[PDB]
Design a protein around this ligand. Sequence first.
Ligand SMILES: [Cl-]
Ligand SMILES: [Cl-]
Ligand SMILES: [Cl-]
Ligand SMILES: [Cl-]
Ligand SMILES: [Cl-]
Ligand SMILES: [Cl-]
Ligand SMILES: [Cl-]
Ligand SMILES: [Cl-]
Ligand SMILES: [Cl-]
Ligand SMILES: [Cl-]
Ligand SMILES: [Mg+2]
Lengths: 91, 93
Amino acid sequence: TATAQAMAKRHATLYGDPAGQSQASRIIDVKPGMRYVNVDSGETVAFRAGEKIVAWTFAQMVRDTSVDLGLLMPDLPGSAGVRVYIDRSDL
Amino acid sequence: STATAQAMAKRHATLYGDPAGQSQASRIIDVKPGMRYVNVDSGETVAFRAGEKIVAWTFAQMVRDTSVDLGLLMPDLPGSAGVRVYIDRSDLF
Ligand SMILES: [Cl-]
Ligand SMILES: [Cl-]
Ligand SMILES: [Cl-]
Ligand SMILES: [Cl-]
Ligand SMILES: [Cl-]
Ligand SMILES: [Cl-]
Ligand SMILES: [Cl-]
Ligand SMILES: [Cl-]
Ligand SMILES: [Cl-]
Ligand SMILES: [Cl-]
Ligand SMILES: [Mg+2]
């Protein structure tokens, strides 16, 4: 389990890095049934569920990619099942 | 005054896509006080909600990344003005 959490954190690294919420350019409220969000390569986004806030800087992706928000932030309530579509990098 | 403006706003909005029905939208975006932007794809059909009012839009196929104010796309959705929609470039070019 601790090992499964380590595995998930390693996989999550493909998609970017944790960031300070002070660094975010927007805060998205994670709501039941929201389905998905769209983010840009390199964008820093804070995700909020009540008083819990977790932020993330998306990596420069080689192609359009998507990922479950629950992989990036398992501790954020309501994150599982919300799809994150990350736009390919301009670079 | 008030009126002519309405008409030129609809004209501006037309460059960015077409009114859509909620039944064709792939997601519903909550429009809340303080919201500043959202990201949509060229060709995406998105519904925007204020309380229980829902207005949907199908974004045009854009030659480059561009933005438009939601308040110009849907003046009758309360709180839409000031929310900027970032539209990703179309893959069709
Ligand atoms: Cl979004
Ligand atoms: Cl927090
Ligand atoms: Cl990278
Ligand atoms: Cl987390
Ligand atoms: Cl969850
Ligand atoms: Cl939705
Ligand atoms: Cl405001
Ligand atoms: Cl609302
Ligand atoms: Cl505009
Ligand atoms: Cl409207
Ligand atoms: Mg794209």
